[PDB]
Design an enzyme around this catalytic site. Structure first.
Site, PDB file in Angstrom:
ATOM      1  N   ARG A 229      -6.703   0.259   3.158  1.00  0.00           N
ATOM      2  CA  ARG A 229      -5.525   0.845   2.595  1.00  0.00           C
ATOM      3  C   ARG A 229      -4.986   0.225   1.457  1.00  0.00           C
ATOM      4  O   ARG A 229      -4.615   0.800   0.651  1.00  0.00           O
ATOM      5  CB  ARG A 229      -4.512   1.489   3.528  1.00  0.00           C
TER       6      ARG A 229
ATOM      7  N   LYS B   5      12.156  -4.759  11.105  1.00  0.00           N
ATOM      8  CA  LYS B   5      11.816  -5.500  10.086  1.00  0.00           C
ATOM      9  C   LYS B   5      12.539  -6.909  10.167  1.00  0.00           C
ATOM     10  O   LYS B   5      12.214  -7.826   9.699  1.00  0.00           O
ATOM     11  CB  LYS B   5      12.015  -4.839   8.636  1.00  0.00           C
TER      12      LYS B   5
ATOM     13  N   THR C  56      -1.502   4.437  12.194  1.00  0.00           N
ATOM     14  CA  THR C  56      -2.672   3.475  12.682  1.00  0.00           C
ATOM     15  C   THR C  56      -3.333   4.145  13.868  1.00  0.00           C
ATOM     16  O   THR C  56      -2.972   5.164  14.413  1.00  0.00           O
ATOM     17  CB  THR C  56      -2.021   2.268  13.048  1.00  0.00           C
TER      18      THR C  56
ATOM     19  N   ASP D 103      -1.060 -11.329   4.117  1.00  0.00           N
ATOM     20  CA  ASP D 103      -0.987 -10.649   5.422  1.00  0.00           C
ATOM     21  C   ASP D 103      -0.851 -11.919   6.572  1.00  0.00           C
ATOM     22  O   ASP D 103      -1.850 -12.802   6.585  1.00  0.00           O
ATOM     23  CB  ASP D 103      -2.232 -10.061   5.801  1.00  0.00           C
TER      24      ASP D 103
ATOM     25  N   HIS E 263       1.375  -5.739   2.416  1.00  0.00           N
ATOM     26  CA  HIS E 263       1.669  -4.868   3.497  1.00  0.00           C
ATOM     27  C   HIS E 263       3.361  -4.946   3.795  1.00  0.00           C
ATOM     28  O   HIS E 263       3.834  -5.969   3.493  1.00  0.00           O
ATOM     29  CB  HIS E 263       1.148  -5.230   5.082  1.00  0.00           C
TER      30      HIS E 263
ATOM     31  N   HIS F  38       0.747  -1.257  -0.229  1.00  0.00           N
ATOM     32  CA  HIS F  38       0.212  -0.095   0.011  1.00  0.00           C
ATOM     33  C   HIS F  38       1.022   1.268   0.074  1.00  0.00           C
ATOM     34  O   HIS F  38       2.203   1.230   0.274  1.00  0.00           O
ATOM     35  CB  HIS F  38      -0.804   0.164   1.365  1.00  0.00           C
TER      36      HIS F  38
ATOM     37  N   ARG G 146       0.581   6.570   4.207  1.00  0.00           N
ATOM     38  CA  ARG G 146      -0.602   6.775   4.991  1.00  0.00           C
ATOM     39  C   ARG G 146      -0.461   7.463   6.101  1.00  0.00           C
ATOM     40  O   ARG G 146       0.559   7.743   6.498  1.00  0.00           O
ATOM     41  CB  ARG G 146      -1.114   4.970   5.356  1.00  0.00           C
TER      42      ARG G 146
END
Ligand SMILES: *[C@@H]1O[C@H](CO)[C@@H](O)[C@H](O)[C@H]1NC(C)=O
Ligand SMILES: *[C@@H]1O[C@H](CO)[C@@H](O)[C@H](O)[C@H]1NC(C)=O
Ligand SMILES: *[C@@H]1O[C@H](CO)[C@@H](O)[C@H](O)[C@H]1NC(C)=O
Ligand SMILES: *[C@@H]1O[C@H](CO)[C@@H](O)[C@H](O)[C@H]1NC(C)=O
Ligand SMILES: *[C@@H]1O[C@H](CO)[C@@H](O)[C@H](O)[C@H]1NC(C)=O
Ligand SMILES: *[C@H]1O[C@H](CO)[C@@H](O)[C@H](O)[C@H]1NC(C)=O
Length: 435
Positions: free
Chosen positions: A135, A270, A58, A180, A330, A52, A55
């Site tokens: 999103r 990550k 969250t 996901d 994602h 995506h 943004r």
């Protein structure tokens, strides 16, 4: 600031150092050969895996940031130097949705995909799936808009039917979704990534907190608050103008050196959360890897991890001969997928104390791999130089040489050799440890 071909090029000494909050920037030719289609080669299949776009924070992070800005404004008796803007700053960010800049990133990505693969795209309606996040779906729709725009501008296009998002894969702890992560119980309970991030933050944040507290007399910051203020640089930038053309005032609070630390913090999160640093990280990418093998080989999916057998067994939801595929996902899942595919098998486990650049980590960083609007292209090409089809992986335009197979100087392997080298994923890896 942001173009179709090069991505985001404004303020690169800051904006390329936001990890997964960096807007995509093209890594064409960066520690890499050209991503150009080689001489006398024709693409026969391409798979796109796209994040995506940019943004808002969250809902939970937005609440946290607002709480902090409010507390700063309630406690500070003065706002000194570069922190002066916080006297009158008004927190207005939303939650979860794409920003206008993030929407345009995805339009641009669809344009770029058409242009790069025009020979096929002229006659092909890609098969498209999206994970069930608003999103992500919205990002898919914007990519399609861009693809269609480019296709309409091309007089050589013969099939201009718009592709639909054919499959939206639910996001649920009990739905097997290759786009996901969520069903691997042991993994979802893992605290390793958060613990590594916290430990590293404890090393670099104290000096920053001291300086900020000096310029905001009356305020007490935690390590966590320092990271929140740094996060605000990216989020405010991608929100405050439609084209992200003005760096947020939060950005200049921190030095270039501090941005390099922040960028590495994100890379650690990550790597130790979703990549090879996590004992079950790459396993989250096995399901997609096996879907990709099925597509590359035009054969039924063989997987017992995060594929859904109903979805992969029905041509309507998983056609085996579509020639172009585009999947929307994602950051975290995309990191796991890239590691499951062996693409970062030249990267040694990241130091938890010393910042190593993407250059010194064989091309791995959060900003190089999963920026906002990240995209990967997995190609099959038929070249006059070789009887067998050749596979190539491009991650944000950088050629990422394949591992596990006899790789050439252009980063490619023969198809069957590549698939053979993915033995770990083909076996289901260590997925049993999930349970
Ligand atoms: C698989 O997908 C089917 C069809 O959508 C659904 O009914 C089922 O619950 C899914 N199972 C899992 C474990 O994802
Ligand atoms: C965090 O640091 C402590 C103390 O240095 C150490 O014992 C622990 O292993 C660290 N956590 C991780 C997961 O690196
Ligand atoms: C603001 O002051 C309150 C009351 O002393 C304190 O509990 C809080 O930690 C402070 N927050 C900040 C960001 O200064
Ligand atoms: C969902 O995945 C689990 C393994 O993670 C497997 O036991 C189950 O069969 C899968 N269900 C479907 C419908 O694919
Ligand atoms: C990448 O490295 C891991 C750990 O050594 C190994 O299990 C996996 O098979 C490798 N992948 C490829 C595609 O070579
Ligand atoms: C290719 O064939 C599949 C069966 O595997 C079918 O569902 C579909 O019509 C084709 N794919 C396309 C053109 O999307």
């Amino acid at each position: 600031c942001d173009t179709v071909d090069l991505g985001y090029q404004c303020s690169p000494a800051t904006s390329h150092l936001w990890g997964q909050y960096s807007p995509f920037f093209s890594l064409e030719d960066e520690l890499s050969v050209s991503s150009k289609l080689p001489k006398d080669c024709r693409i026969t299949l391409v798979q796109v895996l796209s994040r995506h776009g940019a943004r808002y924070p969250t809902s939970s992070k937005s609440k946290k940031y607002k709480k902090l800005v409010t507390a700063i404004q309630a406690n500070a008796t003065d706002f000194k130097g570069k922190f002066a803007f916080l006297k009158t700053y008004n927190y207005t960010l939303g939650a979860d949705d794409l920003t206008p800049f993030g929407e345009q990133q995805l339009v641009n990505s669809g344009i770029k995909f058409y242009q790069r693969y025009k020979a096929l795209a002229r006659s092909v309606v890609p098969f498209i799936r999206a994970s069930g996040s608003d999103r992500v779906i919205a990002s898919g729709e914007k990519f399609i808009e861009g693809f269609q725009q480019a296709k309409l501008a091309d007089p050589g296009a013969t099939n201009r039917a718009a592709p639909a998002i054919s499959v939206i894969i639910p996001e649920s702890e009990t739905f097997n979704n290759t786009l996901d992560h969520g069903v691997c119980t042991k993994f979802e309970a893992s605290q390793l990534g958060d613990e590594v991030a916290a430990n590293f933050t404890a090393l670099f944040a104290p000096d920053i907190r001291a300086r900020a507290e000096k310029h905001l007399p009356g305020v007490t910051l935690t390590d966590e608050d320092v990271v929140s203020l740094m996060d605000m640089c990216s989020f405010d930038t991608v929100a405050r103008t439609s084209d992200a053309s003005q760096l947020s005032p939060f950005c200049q609070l921190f030095t270039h050196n501090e941005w390099k630390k922040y960028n590495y913090l994100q890379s650690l999160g990550k790597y130790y959360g979703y990549g090879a640093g996590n004992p079950l990280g790459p396993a989250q990418g096995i399901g997609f890897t096996n879907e990709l093998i099925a597509r590359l080989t035009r054969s039924p999916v063989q997987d017992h991890t995060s594929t859904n057998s109903t979805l992969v067994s029905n041509p309507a939801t998983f056609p085996l001969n579509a020639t172009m595929y585009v999947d929307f996902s994602h950051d975290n899942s995309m990191v796991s997928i890239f590691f499951a595919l062996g693409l970062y098998n030249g990267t040694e486990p990241l130091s938890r104390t010393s910042v190593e650049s993407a250059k010194e980590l064989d091309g791995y960083s959060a900003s190089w791999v999963v920026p906002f609007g990240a995209r990967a292209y997995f190609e099959t090409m038929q070249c006059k130089s070789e009887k067998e089809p050749l596979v190539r992986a491009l991650i944000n335009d950088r050629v990422v040489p394949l591992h596990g197979c006899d790789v050439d100087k252009l980063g490619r392997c023969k198809l069957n050799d590549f698939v053979k080298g993915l033995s770990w994923a083909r076996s289901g890896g260590n997925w049993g440890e999930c349970f």
